[PDB]
């Protein structure tokens, strides 16, 4: 059909065929018939796609952000970043409010908060760049009265690398003629990483198919999960659909006076990749590639906004956290007042920034949100029963706001 629409069709067909294949395998026995020896082989292609996507996050993010920050005047870059941060904050607040409202209407029913925010601040300013390339600071507790002791756990410190890349790009821009060589070096490295991303996009349909097939094979008795948490799943999915098809497109159309669904058509493939992988960081390379090629977004604007948006802007995470918090409060028959709603919204918005963009990443912040609202923590056990689905529906939105943000900021630049 094309070289950019054929990929979209192949990815959609891959998602549909993965769902069909997973249902067929589950009907034929699923995990019991296959066993771990065959389940590992069955789900391996999706793991391979995830590994390929994760391998290119660090060079792509670092080089793209250094080039983007070094390609703009410090005042212009500061204004663009302030506007992007305001847009991200407003969209996250809207997502949280929508989630709380839908949870209140449809009625579906550890680490300290300060330590979590201190860990976020520590991750913003990493103590080592090489270590931050594969580790993140995390605080555990010891019984010396609990005392917080921090150490580096596995997991790429994307936020610290983003901050360092931005400040290094600003420094390169301030250098002048002396930094032009490094700007060229990082631009060339990012171009090569884009070539690798374009190659990986062709394997992406197979990986997505096997990812969704294995995901719906592993968690068997899906009908029982629906019979248990239908209202909660409906609240989460309806909130994500409203935010990604009604609220964010309305904002895009109001600010740019352009069709937002044509914008979403060009990023359908990274959206399906996000759904398959349930991680914004891994689908970020495909997001940048599709935004730059399929959409008329500027190279520097995309390379600057999309990594920051992937790290920080998470509408789906905030929406899921708010819906889960209200659902757990309803399960405990805990009445929620106006102040309770406000603190729920604020905590969800703050935690969405600190999310690491990895599968099952909202559950970690859910506990801190419930602690802030003094809601019980045991009921999170129910969420993990269906989180594997809900998180996926989050990731789509978590990237969908970023791209629509960039395309919005493009109109601001033009
Ligand atoms: N529930 C969530 O949104 C957690 C983060 C999600 N896995 C992402 O990468 O966007
Ligand atoms: Na947002
Ligand atoms: Na994001
Ligand atoms: Na985040």
Helix locations, 219-314, DSSP H:
222-242, 248-256, 260-266, 268-277, 280-293, 299-311
Torsion 205-206-208-212 (CA) sign: positive
d(CA 142, CA 170): 41
Q: What is the dihedral of CA 386, 392, 397, 399, to 10 degrees?
A: 150
For residue 311, which of 163, 155, 168, 113 has the smallest C-alpha distance?
A: 163
The answer to whether 411 is annotated as binding is: no
CATH number at residue 357: 1.10.3860.10
Resolution in A: 2.7
Is 309 annotated in some ligand binding site? yes
Q: How far is CA 373 from CA 18, 231, 239, 308, 362, in A?
A: 39, 22, 21, 28, 16
Helix, strand, coil % over all residues of the chain, rounded to 5: 80, 5, 15
Neighbours of ion ligand 3 (CB under 5 A): 280, 309-310, 313, 398, 402
Q: Name the residue of 322, 359, 369, 390 whose CB sits within 8 Å of the most ligand 1 atoms, as the mutation to test its pocket.
A: 359
How many independent structural domains does the chain possess?
1
What is the number of the ligand 1 atom nearest to the C-alpha of 279?
9
Ligand 1 atom at minimum distance from 316 CA: 3
DSSP labels, 218-244: HS--HHHHHHHHHHHHHHHHHHHHHII
Separation between Cα atoms, residue 192 and residue 120, nearest integer Å: 31
Closest ligand to C-alpha of residue 350 is: 4
| Residues belonging to the chain | 414
The residue range of the domain holding 334 is 5-413
Q: Judge residue 406's burial from the number of C-beta atoms within 10 Å of its C-beta, 0-12 exposed, 13-18 middle, 19 or more buried.
A: buried
Q: How many CA atoms lie within 13 Å of 251's alpha carbon, on the beta-carbon side?
A: 23
- Pocket of ligand 1, beta carbon within 6 A: 278-280, 314, 316-317, 320, 355, 357-359, 361-362, 391, 394-395, 398
Nearest to 274 by CA among 385, 161, 357: 357
d(CA 80, CA 301): 9
Give whole-number Cα distances, 370 to 24, 37, 198, 363, in Å.
39, 39, 41, 11
d(C-alpha 22, C-alpha 214), whole Å: 6
DSSP string, 119-148: HHHHHHS-S-HHHHTTEEEEEEEE----EE
Tokens of 411: 């109109």
Distance 73 CA to ligand 1 centre (A): 33
Please tell me the distance between residue 101's alpha carbon and the centre of ligand 4 in angstroms. Answer: 22
Method: cryo-EM
Contact in structure between 165 and 132 (CB atoms under 8 Å):
no
Protein residues with C-beta less than 5 angstroms from the ion ligand 2: 88, 91-92, 313, 315
Closest of 62, 308, 102 to residue 193, by C-alpha: 62
Cα separation, 3 vs 193, in Å, equals: 19
Angle between helices 280-293 and 299-311 (to 10 degrees): 160
CA distances 222 to 106, 170, 263, 277, 339, Å, are: 22, 50, 33, 19, 37
Among all chains, which residue has been given the structure tokens 């663009």? 80
């Amino acid at each position: 059909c094309l070289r950019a629409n054929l990929l979209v069709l192949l990815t959609v067909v891959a998602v549909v065929a993965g769902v069909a294949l997973g249902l067929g395998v589950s009907g034929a026995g699923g995990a019991l018939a296959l066993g771990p020896e065959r389940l590992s082989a069955f789900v391996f292609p999706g793991e391979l796609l995830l590994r390929l996507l994760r391998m290119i996050i660090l060079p792509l993010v670092v080089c793209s952000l250094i080039g983007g920050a070094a390609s703009l005047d410090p005042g212009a870059l500061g204004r663009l970043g302030a506007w992007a941060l305001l847009f991200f904050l407003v969209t996250t607040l809207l997502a949280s409010a929508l989630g709380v409202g839908l949870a209140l209407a449809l009625q579906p029913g550890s680490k300290e908060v300060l330590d979590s925010f201190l860990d976020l601040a520590r991750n913003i300013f990493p103590s080592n760049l090489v270590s931050a390339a594969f580790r993140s600071y995390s605080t555990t507790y010891e019984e010396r009265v609990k005392v917080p002791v921090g150490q580096e756990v596995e997991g790429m410190n994307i936020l610290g690398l983003v901050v360092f890349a931005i400040v290094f790009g600003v420094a390169l821009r301030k250098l002048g003629p002396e930094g032009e060589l490094l700007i060229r070096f990082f631009n060339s490295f990012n171009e090569a990483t884009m070539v690798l991303v374009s190659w990986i996009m062709w394997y992406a349909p197979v990986g997505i198919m096997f990812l969704v097939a294995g995901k719906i094979v592993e968690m068997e008795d899906v009908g029982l999960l629906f019979a248990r948490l239908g209202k909660y799943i409906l609240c989460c999915l309806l909130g994500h659909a409203i935010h990604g098809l009604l609220v964010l497109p309305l904002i895009y159309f109001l600010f740019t006076r352009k069709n937002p669904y044509r914008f979403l058509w060009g990023i359908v493939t990274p959206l399906a990749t996000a759904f398959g992988t349930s991680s914004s960081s891994a689908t970020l390379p495909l997001m940048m590639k599709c935004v730059e090629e399929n959409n008329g977004v500027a190279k520097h604007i995309s390379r600057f906004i999309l990594p920051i948006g992937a790290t920080v802007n998470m509408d789906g995470a905030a929406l899921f956290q708010c819906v889960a918090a209200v659902f757990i409060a309803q399960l405990s028959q805990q009445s929620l007042d106006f102040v309770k709603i406000i603190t729920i919204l604020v905590t969800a918005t703050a935690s969405s920034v600190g999310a690491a963009g990895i599968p099952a990443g909202g559950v970690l912040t859910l506990a801190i949100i419930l602690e802030a609202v003094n809601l019980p923590v045991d009921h999170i056990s129910l969420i993990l029963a269906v989180d594997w689905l809900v998180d996926r529906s989050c990731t789509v939105l978590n990237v969908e706001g970023d791209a629509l943000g960039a395309g919005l900021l493009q109109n601001y630049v033009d």
